[PDB]
Amino acid sequence: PYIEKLELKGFKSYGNKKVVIPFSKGFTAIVGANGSGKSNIGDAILFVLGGLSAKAMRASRISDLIFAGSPAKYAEVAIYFNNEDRGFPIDEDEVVIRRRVYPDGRSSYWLNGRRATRSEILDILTAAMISPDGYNIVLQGDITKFIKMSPLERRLLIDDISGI
């Protein structure tokens, strides 16, 4: 599968109204001045795919992800996957996952327009070979994680890829 677009509402620096962010099936480059909000788009992806670590998304707690210019009633991200390849074990050409977090720290999830649990979301993503923290997601300043990891951690990554 691949990401067709994100929809952000009340998410970090993106304001109170719904922001649509489309991607090429191939190679999309994201450019913009220092501090303009680029990495926050990556954080939207971590968030909607079930990220439980506020710190990974540079927040003290998950509610800190809610837009406050100097706030929103909650933060929400929707991610739209093209699933024509049936990578997701769902008989639909589109798989839409949505996560909303409230000021009290609780999250609601939707899968294809129906309420879902976190584990339900995680399981479908795992089946599709996608996770908030896979080797395929390289956050700012973290490319050398692959050379910093122990030889043992490095082999375990290959265990995973091999499917064993």
Partner: protein, 171 residues
């Protein structure tokens, strides 16, 4: 036995990929993946041994930031070639690399994008130039917004960024 067999097929594929890709990204250099315990791999780790200039290994700890990044990138792409992930998200992975090296990385991304989606945040023209689509981010009155950008517009934006002291990640 059976798990060992699946592992070894995967390992040899990724190992060969890694060596080829490292040599591509660093012309004149070479690198290898090594199982700490080839007899029972599951009893040991997986090491990287690199010769950035082709003769003489350079220990990881003695590598420059650029050397570390290239080594890590060769590894990520070695996996990608064997088993393309649905998407990759790379945030300023070109820090500490000169234009020559960033171009080689960008070329590898372009080729790999036939099989996986790549989303790359970058301040580098030589990274951006052949992207299929460009998203522009800007902040006004504390709020971020995105637009779609043409290459000509994106280039002007990067020109303005490169003019300011310390634009690069890590400053």
């Amino acid at each position: 036995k059976e798990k060992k067999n699946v592992f070894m097929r995967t390992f040899e594929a990724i190992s060969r990929n890694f060596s080829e890709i490292f040599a591509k990204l660093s012309p004149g250099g070479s690198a290898r993946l090594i199982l700490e315990n080839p007899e029972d791999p599951f009893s040991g780790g997986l090491e990287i041994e690199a010769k950035p200039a082709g003769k003489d290994v350079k220990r990881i700890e003695a590598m420059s930031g650029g050397e570390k990044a290239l080594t890590a990138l060769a590894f990520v792409f070695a996996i990608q070639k064997f088993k393309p992930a649905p998407f990759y998200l790379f945030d300023e992975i070109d820090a500490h690399l000169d234009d020559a090296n960033v171009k080689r990385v960008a070329d590898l991304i372009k080729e790999s994008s036939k099989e996986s989606q790549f989303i790359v945040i970058t301040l580098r023209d030589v990274m951006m130039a052949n992207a299929d689509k460009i998203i522009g981010v800007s902040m006004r009155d504390g709020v971020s917004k995105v637009v779609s950008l043409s290459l000509e517009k994106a280039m002007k934006i990067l020109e303005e960024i490169r003019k300011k002291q310390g634009w690069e990640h890590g400053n």
